Write a protein that binds this DNA or RNA. Structure first.
Lengths: 139, 32
DNA sequence: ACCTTATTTGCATAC
DNA sequence: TGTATGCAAATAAGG
């Protein structure tokens, strides 16, 4: 159980205690990756300490971070796909495909995947995300 | 300098924002 | 399946 | 050289 009051104080306390232990934000995530299956990023740790994550996202991460800090203070020390980086050339081709066909078919997605040497699901997700972006930018 | 249009996804409501709203409400409630 | 809407995250990069 | 952040891939949850 947690409350906004407790979360505000843990983020303050966590940053203070981690720096004294000598861990950087990225090191915390990498240690989290060994302790817990999912490897967390420096970006996520910075957002947790800045209270710039959702209430439930923070409530979920707090116990995992608390165990690491207490376990690491005790003893001295020191299922999610990796984000695919789409190079500028691949992105420009995909944007061109989005113009001529806004919603590609699975067969069209498969061809584009072979053309740009990318996995199909990534292309499918890219078009899904791209469509949502168009909706937000142009209400 | 010209304002850009924010492109991307944002946390709809951050804990930071929720905390700020409480303090605003608490200020009015404390007075009343 | 994969469309949708709605969040969770993380590269890349500016500080 | 760490930390903050824009932009957006990955995921979750309904049709």
């Amino acid at each position: 159980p947690s409350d906004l009051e407790e979360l505000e104080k843990f983020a303050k306390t966590f940053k203070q205690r981690r720096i004294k232990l000598g861990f950087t934000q990225g090191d915390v995530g990498l240690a989290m990756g060994k302790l817990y299956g999912n490897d967390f990023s420096q970006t996520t740790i910075s957002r947790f300490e800045a209270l710039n994550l959702s209430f439930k996202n923070m409530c979920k991460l707090k116990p995992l971070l608390e165990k690491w800090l207490n376990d690491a203070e005790s003893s001295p020390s020191d299922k999610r796909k990796k984000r695919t980086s789409i190079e500028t050339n691949i992105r420009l081709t995909l944007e061109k495909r989005f113009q001529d066909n806004p919603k590609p078919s699975s067969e069209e997605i498969s061809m584009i995947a072979e053309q740009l040497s990318m996995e199909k699901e990534v292309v499918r997700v890219w078009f899904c995300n791209r469509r949502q972006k168009e909706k937000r930018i142009n209400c | 300098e010209k304002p850009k249009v924010y492109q991307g996804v944002r946390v709809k409501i951050t804990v930071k924002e929720l905390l700020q709203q409480r303090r605003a409400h608490q200020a009015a409630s404390g007075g009343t």
